[PDB]
Amino acid sequence: AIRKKLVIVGDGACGKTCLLIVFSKDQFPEVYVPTVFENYVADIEVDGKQVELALWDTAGQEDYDRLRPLSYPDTDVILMCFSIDSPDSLENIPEKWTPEVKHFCPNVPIILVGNKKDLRNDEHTRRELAKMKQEPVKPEEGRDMANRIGAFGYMECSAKTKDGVREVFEMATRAALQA
Amino acid sequence: SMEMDEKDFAADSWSLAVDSSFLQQHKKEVMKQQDVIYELIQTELHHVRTLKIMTRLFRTGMLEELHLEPGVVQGLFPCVDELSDIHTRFLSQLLERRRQALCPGSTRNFVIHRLGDLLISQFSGPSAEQMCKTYSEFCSRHSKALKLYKELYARDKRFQQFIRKVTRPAVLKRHGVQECILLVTQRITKYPLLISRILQHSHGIEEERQDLTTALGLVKELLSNVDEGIYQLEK
Numbered sequence: 092a093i094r095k096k097l098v099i100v101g102d103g104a105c106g107k108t109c110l111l112i113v114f115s116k117d118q119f120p121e122v123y124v125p126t127v128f129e130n131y132v133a134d135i136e137v138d139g140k141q142v143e144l145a146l147w148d149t150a151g152q153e154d155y156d157r158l159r160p161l162s163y164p165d166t167d168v169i170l171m172c173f174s175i176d177s178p179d180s181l182e183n184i185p186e187k188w189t190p191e192v193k194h195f196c197p198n199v200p201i202i203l204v205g206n207k208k209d210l211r212n213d214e215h216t217r218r219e220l221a222k223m224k225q226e227p228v229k230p231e232e233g234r235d236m237a238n239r240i241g242a243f244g245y246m247e248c249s250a251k252t253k254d255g256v257r258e259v260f261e262m263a264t265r266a267a268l269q270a
Numbered sequence: 271s272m273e274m275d276e277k278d279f280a281a282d283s284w285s286l287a288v289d290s291s292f293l294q295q296h297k298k299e300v301m302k303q304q305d306v307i308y309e310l311i312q313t314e315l316h317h318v319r320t321l322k323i324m325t326r327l328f329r330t331g332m333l334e335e336l337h338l339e340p341g342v343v344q345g346l347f348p349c350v351d352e353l354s355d356i357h358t359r360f361l362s363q364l365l366e367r368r369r370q371a372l373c374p375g376s377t378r379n380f381v382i383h384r385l386g387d388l389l390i391s392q393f394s395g396p397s398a399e400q401m402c403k404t405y406s407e408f409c410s411r412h413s414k415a416l417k418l419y420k421e422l423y424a425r426d427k428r429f430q431q432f433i434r435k436v437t438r439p440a441v442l443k444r445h446g447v448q449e450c451i452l453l454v455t456q457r458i459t460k461y462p463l464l465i466s467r468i469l470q471h472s473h474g475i476e477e478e479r480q481d482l483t484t485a486l487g488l489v490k491e492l493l494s495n496v497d498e499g500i501y502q503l504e505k
């Protein structure tokens with residue numbers, strides 16, 4: 092079983108930690124949603140291939156530009172995260188996360204993942220965004236950003252309801268297997 | 271790890287670690303504050319267990335079972351004894367603070383009212399300087415350690431045999447040489463996340479909100495200094 096490495100990058104409260112914890116636990120944490128994610132090795136069978144997928148997180152490293160690159164060695168797939176309820180986090184994708192990921196990880200597939208897709212039809216999320224003269228990130232805006240930054244693909248999911256989570260990690264495994 | 275602490279931190283949270291009737295005696299904010307504290311100690315326990323895997327299982331294994339130069343083993347596992355002494359004393363202090371808070375007649379029901387002082391002493395003074403100097407060195411030697419391990423695995427067949435043996439148990443699934451090295455580097459950036467979420471549920475005792483705020487600034491000053499002192503080495 093081939094070993095492959097996955098790293099999730101993105102702004103602070105974009106939900107990258109929640110996503111890893113939901114995938115590794117299989118369910119949304121019932122009694123306690125943890126604060127941090129250490130690491131996890133997942134046994135995935137994508138399209139008839141058995142892979143060991145090491146899952147890493149960059150949460151906590153966002154302000155430390157000399158520490159953070161130490162997460163990048165030997166990465167096979169980058170999950171580039173952004174939050175659908177935060178259009179500002181999407182603006183930082185081509186300005187900050189794409190130049191850095193492409194510098195330390197040349198030729199490493201990136202899947203642009205749009206987290207928190209459930210909040211797209213939430214009442215409180217739309218009212219607060221309207222005060223700031225905005226609205227949730229539309230699917231076409233995510234696809235237009237994944238296209239502009241040369242991402243391998245664009246995928247959406249919800250850590251809360253678990254919809255689309257299994258498919259993001261399965262696709263990441265397929266992307267990491269390409270050479 | 272020791273079975274006593276493995277069992278004490280086996281539960282997924284503080285709410286499931288304490289007795290159900292003991293949990294029913296407290297306010298919701300108390301349950302939330304203790305869940306985050308329990309996690310700080312749980313991850314500290316796992317952090318020290320990681321550092322012991324690097325020192326006794328990998329490092330000591332390569333010294334007794336292999337004909338490698340002692341300078342090669344030091345390159346694969348830099349500052350691991352110092353990191354082991356630093357965090358073992360911290361885990362010690364966190365575990366004693368939990369035992370002092372234990373209910374008489376019980377070994378699992380506890381509520382920690384004071385944590386801030388413990389963190390202020392760890393993240394300040396000569397203890398913080400020792401830790402800052404140690405992590406700046408560790409993180410500057412992290413790349414050279416990954417590259418050195420990869421060269422040894424791609425040239426030496428006896429080193430390949432050693433790695434297949436030590437990491438064969440299921441226990442070591444996410445804990446190989448390289449995983450351990452990254453586990454140790456990402457650890458310091460976990461503390462401000464934990465201390466901020468603890469501070470968020472510590473607005474009962476005012477001296478405690480000020481202690482967690484002082485420790486939060488201490489961890490960030492420390493992290494900023496570890497980050498400023500990083501200077502990646504090459505083979």
Ligand SMILES: *CC(=O)Nc1cccc(C)c1
Nearest residue numbers: 289291292373374376379
């Ligand atoms: C000290 C102690 O363990 N107290 C306690 C209170 C309520 C319920 C139980 C089982 C114990």
